[PDB]
Structures are given as C-alpha cells and as structure tokens.
Amino acid sequence: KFNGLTVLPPLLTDEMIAQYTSALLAGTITSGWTFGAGAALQIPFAMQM
Amino acid sequence: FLPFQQFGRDIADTTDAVRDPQTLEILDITPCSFGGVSVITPGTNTSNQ
C-alpha cells in the first residue's frame, strides 16, 4: 500500500474462515452426511463408517 | 546510510529514504495516505441515510 497498490482486506477474516472449517468438521464428526442435505441428524461416528 | 549515500530505494525501486544534502539526518519516505470512498446506503425507496 506504500507504493500505490491498494490491497483491500477480505470480507472473511482468518478466524471466521477457520470457524467455517471447524463447523464443517464438527458436522462431519457428528451429523455426517445429513446436514448437507437438510437438518443436522445426530449419528455416532462408529455407525457412520 | 554510508557517507556517500544521498538517497535510497526499497524493493520496488521507489525512493523510501533520503539524506539531507545540507545537514546530516536520515528520514524514511512514506507516500501520503489515500484510498477509495465507499458509500453505505440502503435503497432509494428505503431511506436517505
């Protein structure tokens, strides 16, 4: 930004993109394939495999 | 700065520093701040804020 090329910051910061990832991981560990196609349905991961 | 060095440049080959030709002082050159004007307004039929 000192030489005249302005870098605009992204709308999603690093903590929230990482929160999107942790949300998608927590959903795969718990809800599995359900929350992508609908409401999150709790299933144990031992039965998920 | 070394004794024979008048000014100096950064990685962009733009001058980031200059030494006083009269007295002895070393100052960094930072261009003046600028940027774009972003307008936050709702629709014309909502309000004028």
The reply to whether residue B10 touches residue A3, judged by beta carbons under 8 angstroms, is: yes
Q: Which residue has the tokens 């629709």?
A: B43
- Give the DSSP H or E segment for B28: strand B26-28
Task: Report yes or no: A44 at the B interface, CB cutoff 8 Å.
Answer: no
The answer to whether B3 faces chain A, any CB pair under 8 Å, is no
| Beta carbons of B8 and B1 less than 8 angstroms apart | yes
Radius of gyration for chain B, computed over Cα atoms and rounded to the nearest angstrom = 22
Instruction: Tell me if A17 sits within 8 A of A11, measured CB to CB.
Output: no
Q: How many angstroms is the resolution?
A: 2.8
- The shortest C-alpha distance from A15 to chain B (Å) reads 25
| Cβ–Cβ under 8 Å, residues A40 and A31 | yes
Give the SS3 label for residue B9: strand
The experimental technique used to determine this model is: cryo-EM
Q: What is the C-alpha separation between B28 and B35, in angstroms, rounded? A: 21
Q: Give the C-alpha separation, A29 to A39, whole Å.
A: 15
Amino acid at the residue B4: F
Nearest one of B49, B36, B13, B22 to A6, comparing CA atoms: B36
The answer to whether the beta carbons of residues A40 and A27 sit under 8 Å apart is yes
The C-alpha R_g of chain A, in whole angstroms, comes to 18
